[PDB]
Write a protein that binds this ligand. Structure first.
Ligand SMILES: *[C@@H]1O[C@H](CO)[C@@H](O)[C@H](O)[C@H]1NC(C)=O
Ligand SMILES: *[C@@H]1O[C@H](CO)[C@@H](O)[C@H](O)[C@H]1NC(C)=O
Ligand SMILES: *[C@@H]1O[C@H](CO)[C@@H](O)[C@H](O)[C@H]1NC(C)=O
Lengths: 97, 49, 145
């Protein structure tokens, strides 16, 4: 329901969905999107299915091409400063398709 | 030969023995060289004359 | 300076700030598991000093590299230099893009990051304190036996 959405909000108002009380199988994320940026910072992309997380936040927003590389901890730009800023200590992954 | 933690170890003992071949009398082995290669080895081959 | 070591191995590589905390016997992380792994019975020294003057320039520098995608874990003191795209699902895919990911991504460095993202220059020193003819010593006196 976060990857089959039809109206992913803009970056200026990034919808934040709270994911809890569920088993997080990432193959359902793997099959829904032909990725182009599945970079991870705090955890290993191969090693997601063997960890338990207290809570998972899924911020979804459609954005331009270069801005995909813009979105990363410790970055700059018109989006990284005024629209969405990833904290330097980010423990999670980003997905772009 | 062996490659425990690199450090290629070579042991030897010569003896124009019985001449039979793999003989049976006991024989120890005296190391000759021990050199720290520290690489990956999986396959082995021998040269001729 | 008062020991004798059989042989000394010096491994040098630049990693990021958190990665210095990662580098230690049997730690966890894509560097400790896919990029470099020390033996658990390690007998040596790790050295780490900040280098923002040699690994940074204006307009950025993306020269360095590191691996996040490896078929298995890294055995201690083993190098896995190779460019093979990680398999995802069941596709024998060979290329970049969706579910065909390059194993190694850039370690891009700029003069302006946070300390945890600064270019830390790390060199590790490995000793071998066993019963063998040593090679390396320090100050010495040659009193007659
Ligand atoms: C949405 O769900 C349908 C029904 O299972 C599926 O066929 C489709 O691939 C899904 N699309 C996305 C983007 O998740
Ligand atoms: C998130 O908010 C946007 C607002 O435009 C909406 O279009 C989208 O459907 C929302 N996604 C959810 C609730 O999963
Ligand atoms: C050495 O290479 C072989 C063949 O690729 C591989 O099976 C083995 O795991 C490697 N091991 C080490 C110690 O590098």
């Amino acid at each position: 329901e976060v990857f089959n959405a039809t109206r992913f909000a803009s970056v200026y108002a990034w919808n934040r969905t709270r994911i809890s009380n569920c088993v997080a199988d990432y193959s359902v994320l793997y099959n829904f999107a032909p990725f182009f940026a599945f970079k991870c910072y705090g955890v290993s992309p191969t090693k997601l299915n063997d960890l338990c997380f207290t809570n998972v936040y899924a911020d979804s927003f459609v954005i331009k091409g270069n801005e995909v590389s813009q979105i990363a901890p410790g970055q700059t730009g018109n989006i990284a400063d005024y629209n969405y800023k990833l904290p330097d200590d980010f423990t999670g992954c980003v997905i772009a398709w | 030969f062996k490659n425990i933690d690199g450090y290629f170890k070579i042991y030897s003992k010569h003896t124009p023995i019985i001449g039979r071949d793999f003989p049976q009398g006991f024989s120890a082995l005296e190391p000759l060289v021990d050199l720290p290669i520290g690489i990956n080895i999986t396959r082995f081959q021998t040269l001729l004359a | 300076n008062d020991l004798c070591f059989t042989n000394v191995y010096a491994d040098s590589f630049v990693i990021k700030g958190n990665e210095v905390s990662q580098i230690a016997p049997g730690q966890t992380g894509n560097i400790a598991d896919y990029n470099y792994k020390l033996p658990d019975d390690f007998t040596g020294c790790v050295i780490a000093w900040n280098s923002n003057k040699l690994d940074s320039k204006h307009s950025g520098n993306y020269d360095y590299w590191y691996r996040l995608f490896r078929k298995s874990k890294l055995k201690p003191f083993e190098r896995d230099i190779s460019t093979e795209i990680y398999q995802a699902g069941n596709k024998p895919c060979k290329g970049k893009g969706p579910n065909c990911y390059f194993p190694l991504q850039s370690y891009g460095f700029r003069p302006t990051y946070g300390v945890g993202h600064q270019p830390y220059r790390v060199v590790v020193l490995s000793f071998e304190l066993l019963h063998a003819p040593a090679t390396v010593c320090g100050p010495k006196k040659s009193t007659n036996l």
